[PDB]
Amino acid sequence: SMKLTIPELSLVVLIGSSGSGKSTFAKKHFKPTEVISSDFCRGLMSDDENDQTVTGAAFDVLHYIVSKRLQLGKLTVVDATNVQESARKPLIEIAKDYHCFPVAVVFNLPEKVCQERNKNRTDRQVEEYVIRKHTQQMKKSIKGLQREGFRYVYILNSPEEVEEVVFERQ
Amino acid sequence: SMKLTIPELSLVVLIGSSGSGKSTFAKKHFKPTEVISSDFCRGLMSDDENDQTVTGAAFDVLHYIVSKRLQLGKLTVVDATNVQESARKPLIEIAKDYHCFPVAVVFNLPEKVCQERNKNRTDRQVEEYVIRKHTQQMKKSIKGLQREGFRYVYILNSPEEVEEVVFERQP
Numbered sequence: 001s002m003k004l005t006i007p008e009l010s011l012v013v014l015i016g017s018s019g020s021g022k023s024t025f026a027k028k029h030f031k032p033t034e035v036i037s038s039d040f041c042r043g044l045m046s047d048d049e050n051d052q053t054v055t056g057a058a059f060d061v062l063h064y065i066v067s068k069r070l071q072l073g074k075l076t077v078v079d080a081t082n083v084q085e086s087a088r089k090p091l092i093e094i095a096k097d098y099h100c101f102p103v104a105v106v107f108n109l110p111e112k113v114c115q116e117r118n119k120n121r122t123d124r125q126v127e128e129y130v131i132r133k134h135t136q137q138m139k140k141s142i143k144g145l146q147r148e149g150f151r152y153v154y155i156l157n158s159p160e161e162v163e164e165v166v167f168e169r170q
Numbered sequence: 171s172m173k174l175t176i177p178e179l180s181l182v183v184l185i186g187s188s189g190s191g192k193s194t195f196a197k198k199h200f201k202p203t204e205v206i207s208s209d210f211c212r213g214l215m216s217d218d219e220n221d222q223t224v225t226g227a228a229f230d231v232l233h234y235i236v237s238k239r240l241q242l243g244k245l246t247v248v249d250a251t252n253v254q255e256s257a258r259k260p261l262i263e264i265a266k267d268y269h270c271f272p273v274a275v276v277f278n279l280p281e282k283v284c285q286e287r288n289k290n291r292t293d294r295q296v297e298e299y300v301i302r303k304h305t306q307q308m309k310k311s312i313k314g315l316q317r318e319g320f321r322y323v324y325i326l327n328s329p330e331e332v333e334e335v336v337f338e339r340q341p
């Protein structure tokens with residue numbers, strides 16, 4: 001298997017395009033309450049799904065909920081795309097502020113894998129150009145992750161590697 | 171700074187071309203006895219320095235010394251190029267056998283940086299084609315490090331990042 005080591009108290013940041021399988025991964029490895037997703041926070045602001053305007057407020061709520069969990073010393077997983085540096089920086093700063101280890105888990109899958117899963121989703125789907133952009137941004141992000149402030153950086157390079165992950169909470 | 175976390179008991183494997191600054195790094199961060207270099211083991215087999223005719227035997231000696239240290243539960247740093255998978259696999263297997271974390275520290279520096287430092291070395295120098303080959307092999311190695319068995323993988327992308335490294339050992 002592929003053992004990923006994380007401290008008992010950490011902020012685990014999922015990084016991947018839409019369709020890369022982040023939420024599936026989160027549900028398999030973590031308890032429901034450990035996981036905080038952007039879609040969930042969007043749902044706190046709106047019953048609808050297509051309202052492009054609640055996004056900023058939703059991310060504010062995401063950051064605040066994450067902040068209070070870490071304050072209480074509770075391991076937290078951020079289920080969002082996180083392919084942009086601007087999305088990643090505040091998570092890192094929150095983690096440092098509460099003396100937690102920020103951990104990056106990167107879903108370095110080929111674009112066609114994401115595009116394929118997207119077309120078969122039963123919950124919601126995105127436009128093709130969105131996944132293409134996410135993937136390009138994801139790839140651009142990899143090299144600078146350690147320097148951004150992530151203490152552990154784990155790159156998953158194929159669905160097989162993703163499948164074989166086991167977490168080891170020292 | 172750039173904090174690199176390592177368990178109290180680990181095998182730290184330095185990965186980089188000649189001239190990338192591994193031994194400098196080792197001396198700055200670790201105690202002399204924690205560090206085992208290929209040059210040193212070559213020196214056990216031959217007075218002729220950087221002697222190439224004793225290379226295999228020297229690596230056998232390096233593997234054996236590393237093995238006994240981990241057996242005694244002593245953190246060990248392997249100061250060698252380590253840019254080939256064949257050089258890295260046995261280190262990983264030794265670490266596993268003694269229930270130790272293998273940790274990879276990669277000196278992902280541009281070739282020209284290594285070539286430049288090489289020309290100014292006062293101890294020993296290598297041919298330019300050697301550093302070019304090392305660098306290409308180093309770059310090819312990076313992606314598969316985790317899958318090879320390294321528990322923590324640290325990539326240093328510039329001399330600045332290398333400079334700013336501080337190790338954090340928690341037992």
Ligand SMILES: Nc1ccn([C@@H]2O[C@H](COP(=O)(O)OP(=O)(O)OP(=O)(O)O)[C@@H](O)[C@H]2O)c(=O)n1
Nearest residue numbers: 017018019020021022023024025117120121122
């Ligand atoms: N190992 C996996 C992971 C995901 N999927 C498929 O991918 C689709 C969506 O995966 P999801 O986990 O929702 O991807 P996310 O990264 O969460 O996408 P988003 O950012 O849009 O939430 C699901 O229908 C699922 O069938 C799959 O077949 N096998």
Ligand SMILES: Nc1ccn([C@@H]2O[C@H](COP(=O)(O)OP(=O)(O)OP(=O)(O)O)[C@@H](O)[C@H]2O)c(=O)n1
Nearest residue numbers: 187188189190191192193194195287290291292
């Ligand atoms: N930050 C650094 C580190 C090293 N050097 C110089 O670069 C040369 C090679 O450094 P060294 O640690 O000896 O490189 P290694 O990677 O150990 O080379 P080898 O594989 O040959 O042992 C030395 O002159 C050293 O003074 C430097 O100028 N600045």
Ligand SMILES: [Mg+2]
Nearest residue numbers: 022023024079
């Ligand atoms: Mg999802």
Ligand SMILES: [Mg+2]
Nearest residue numbers: 192193194249
């Ligand atoms: Mg050296």
